[PDB]
């Protein structure tokens, strides 16, 4: 039984770097949703009209 075992080890809980942690926690979600939206847009507007033009080029040379 120590006397000083039951006192708090940290003191005051900070309230603005917890809010700033939680707003970044919920803002990288919204920016990740928009980033995913524009990257599927890029991956289907550019990447598959690239494989679609190179497969027809490589079928000829595979012949």
């Amino acid at each position: 039984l120590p006397p000083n075992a039951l006192k708090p080890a940290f003191g005051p809980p900070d309230k603005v770097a917890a809010q700033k942690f939680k707003e970044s926690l919920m803002a990288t979600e919204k920016h990740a949703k928009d980033t995913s939206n524009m990257w599927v847009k890029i991956s289907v507007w550019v990447a598959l009209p690239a494989i679609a033009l190179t497969a027809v080029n490589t079928y000829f040379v595979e012949k």
Binding site: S24, A27, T28, H31, T35, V46
Partner: protein
């Protein structure tokens, strides 16, 4: 006119253009910061090498823009090198015969 003059600076301009496209797209991807630095690097690099491969197929487009200038090189100035290496043996043979 200008076409071969910077088409033998061909693979020295496209790597500089790659460095230009990555280190230029870096400020446009970094001006709106909420991503971590690694995601900014990979997206700026993802744009930049689409640019370099498009510019490289423009490179082969220039390559057959450009040698309807003079046909059948890779030998027609080995012609040059061998032709004057030949008669620089001639310039020595004479005044060692007459010297």
């Amino acid at each position: 006119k200008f076409v071969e003059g910077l088409s033998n600076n061909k693979y020295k301009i496209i790597t500089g253009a790659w460095a230009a496209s990555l280190y230029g797209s870096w400020v446009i991807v970094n001006k709106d910061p909420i991503m971590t630095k690694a995601q900014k690097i990979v997206q700026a690099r993802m744009y930049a090498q689409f640019i370099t491969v498009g510019l490289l197929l423009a490179s082969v487009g220039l390559s057959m823009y450009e040698n309807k200038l003079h046909p059948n090189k890779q030998k027609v100035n080995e012609m040059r090198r061998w032709e004057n290496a030949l008669r620089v043996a001639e310039e020595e043979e004479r005044l060692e015969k007459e010297g």
